[PDB]
Amino acid sequence: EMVETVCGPVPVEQLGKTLIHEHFLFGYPGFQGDVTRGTFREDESLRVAVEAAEKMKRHGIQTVVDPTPNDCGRNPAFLRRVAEETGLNIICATGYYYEGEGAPPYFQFRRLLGTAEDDIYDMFMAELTEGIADTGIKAGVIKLASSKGRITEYEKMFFRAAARAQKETGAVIITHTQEGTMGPEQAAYLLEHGADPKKIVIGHMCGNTDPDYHRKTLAYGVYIAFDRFGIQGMVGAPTDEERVRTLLALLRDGYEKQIMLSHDTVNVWLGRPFTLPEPFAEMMKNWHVEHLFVNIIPALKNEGIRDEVLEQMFIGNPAALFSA
Ligand SMILES: [Co+2]
Numbered sequence: 676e677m678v679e680t681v682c683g684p685v686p687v688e689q690l691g692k693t694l695i696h697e698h699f700l701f702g703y704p705g706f707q708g709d710v711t712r713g714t715f716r717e718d719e720s721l722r723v724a725v726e727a728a729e730k731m732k733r734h735g736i737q738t739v740v741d742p743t744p745n746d747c748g749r750n751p752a753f754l755r756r757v758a759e760e761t762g763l764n765i766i767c768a769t770g771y772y773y774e775g776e777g778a779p780p781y782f783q784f785r786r787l788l789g790t791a792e793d794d795i796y797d798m799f800m801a802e803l804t805e806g807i808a809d810t811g812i813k814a815g816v817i818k819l820a821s822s823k824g825r826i827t828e829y830e831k832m833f834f835r836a837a838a839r840a841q842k843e844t845g846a847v848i849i850t851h852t853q854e855g856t857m858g859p860e861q862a863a864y865l866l867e868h869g870a871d872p873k874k875i876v877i878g879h880m881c882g883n884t885d886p887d888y889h890r891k892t893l894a895y896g897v898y899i900a901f902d903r904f905g906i907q908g909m910v911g912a913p914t915d916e917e918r919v920r921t922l923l924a925l926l927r928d929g930y931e932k933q934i935m936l937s938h939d940t941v942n943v944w945l946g947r948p949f950t951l952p953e954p955f956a957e958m959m960k961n962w963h964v965e966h967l968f969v970n971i972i973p974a975l976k977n978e979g980i981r982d983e984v985l986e987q988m989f990i991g992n993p994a995a996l997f998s999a
């Protein structure tokens with residue numbers, strides 16, 4: 676019936692067209708130490724975020740999940756400003772990034788105390804059921820993440836505590852997979868600690884190009900997201916053409932009730948600005964929150980993909996994901 680958004684509860688029935696994985700702001704852990712030269716210009720970056728949300732609305736999107744980790748610049752109050760100014764629903768998360776590119780020394784120290792997993796559990800409950808900092812905003816998903824080929828010991832604590840917190844709240848889990856690895860293992864590890872696969876999104880499933888690997892993960896009964904459309908070449912990413920071919924194999928198999936699509940945009944980088952070198956810059960060309968609507972879905976349509984399979988993926992799936 677209801678979901679925690681950054682404006683408070685919203686009926687799941689009103690979510691309609693949803694993107695499952697976009698960032699209004701995002702930073703690599705450490706951006707905070709570079710504050711002098713990488714300042715966070717709020718009004719400029721709110722303007723940008725606001726245009727991003729208008730661009731999504733012009734294509735019928737009524738809800739975005741922003742799964743920005745706690746250690747990657749999550750900022751619920753800033754998202755509430757975006758929601759207030761556009762009427763877009765924005766569901767936010769609680770969780771940390773994977774060990775490779777996250778902030779690990781804090782919870783590694785607590786591991787030595789023996790309190791880490793409960794501490795993380797306790798943080799999931801607080802932010803899911805109470806609110807985040809002095810914000811009054813609750814998280815609507817638990818964000819999880821693993822490394823390349825390994826769900827590390829560190830990562831495993833967050834996974835086990837996420838299973839505990841979901842058993843108690845019925846909360847949704849959205850994960851990160853690194854470079855197309857560990858989708859099946861995440862699904863296995865989660866159900867083995869009792870999590871409910873009807874509330875799990877294994878993410879960046881499109882980073883893997885072998886449909887057997889998709890079907891293996893899909894075998895657990897979980898959702899998968901093809902959520903990096905337009906990310907090409909960078910961070911081991913395959914091409915949009917390889918992603919489309921993969922999604923085709925799975926639509927053909929009838930798996931559309933388990934699949935969701937998004938772009939994983941970062942609309943405002945936290946920290947000091949940068950440019951990509953003209954190789955990669957040109958291959959990253961289409962990484963904007965409109966590419967699904969202008970390029971991706973058209974090409975699906977050309978192939979015979981029917982409107983209602985689309986809808987199943989952008990409407991029916993989010994509805995059911997968030998429903999009890
Ligand atoms: Co990710």
Ligand SMILES: [Co+2]
Pocket residue numbers: 696698742939
């Ligand atoms: Co992301």
